[PDB]
Amino acid sequence: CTFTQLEIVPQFGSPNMFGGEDEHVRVMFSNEDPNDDNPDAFPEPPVYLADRDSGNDCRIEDGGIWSRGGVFLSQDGRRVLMHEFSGSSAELVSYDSATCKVVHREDISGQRWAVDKDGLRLGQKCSGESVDSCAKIVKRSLAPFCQT
């Protein structure tokens, strides 16, 4: 199951909302930073998920600080994979798009990371934020993050 990154942008007509959509899922955050109208992260829940195949929506009510565009959608629209962090720790967390329930969560603290058609890559002894600057690099399956 493949995840494509979902770019998160300002919505016109809804003053501090940021989100993005595809054929299956719409995702949305609200920006509550008083100083920044272009923030990199959203720490205040909820996250709103809309399932466009059912017409229903649900809220994720708690959660690590979410990274704008560390949000990814699965090919079938069933899972929404999100990067979340706090202090120096971080994690990748897959939610069910119909129920907003957490399906899988992986602690990736201390590692650089990247998600693409091929899967997930984590790295250490990095010189930079990109995983490519990492000396050791590990390829990890995304299968537990999205299942049938």
């Binding site: 920044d36 962090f85 202090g87 720790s89 602690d107 603290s109």
Partner: protein, 146 residues
């Protein structure tokens, strides 16, 4: 009064306290560098180690709000919280509390740029809602600003 300290945060920012790991990607490093510039004695180690050290040596404040008060008085204030894996530390500076409760800070982070604050984020915007309420604030007994 917090000038002396602000300066210390901006200079300490571009530096690399440890090896080839620049401070902006290492909270422990960044704090050590600020403590360097100010000539303040800070426990050696990684983040957790630093928290244990501060726990034992340093005067512990009761709230983020008081943390910003001490910080406003040109003292050095470290917000710290431990993790199973990698803990986190940050230098508390003066100015408005986010959600009337979390004081502004400077910190680098291995989490990525999102966890980095150049005085523009509060500790409440670098730690999440859970961790945000479990922070400890520590202060050094001598006003590093004159």
């Amino acid at each position: 009064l917090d000038q002396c300290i602000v300066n210390a945060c901006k200079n300490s920012w571009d530096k690399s306290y440890l090896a080839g790991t620049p401070n902006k990607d290492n909270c422990s490093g960044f704090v050590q560098s600020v403590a360097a510039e100010l000539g303040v004695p800070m426990p050696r180690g990684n983040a957790n180690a630093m928290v244990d050290g501060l726990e034992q040596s340093w005067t512990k404040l009761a709230s983020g709000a008081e943390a910003a008060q001490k910080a406003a008085q040109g003292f050095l204030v470290i917000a710290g919280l431990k993790g199973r894996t990698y803990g986190h530390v940050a230098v508390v500076i003066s100015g408005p509390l986010y959600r009337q409760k979390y004081p502004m800070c400077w910190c680098g982070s291995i989490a990525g740029a999102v966890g980095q604050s150049q005085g523009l984020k509060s500790v409440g915007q670098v730690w999440n809602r859970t961790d945000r309420d479990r922070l400890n604030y520590y202060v050094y007994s001598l006003a590093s600003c004159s």
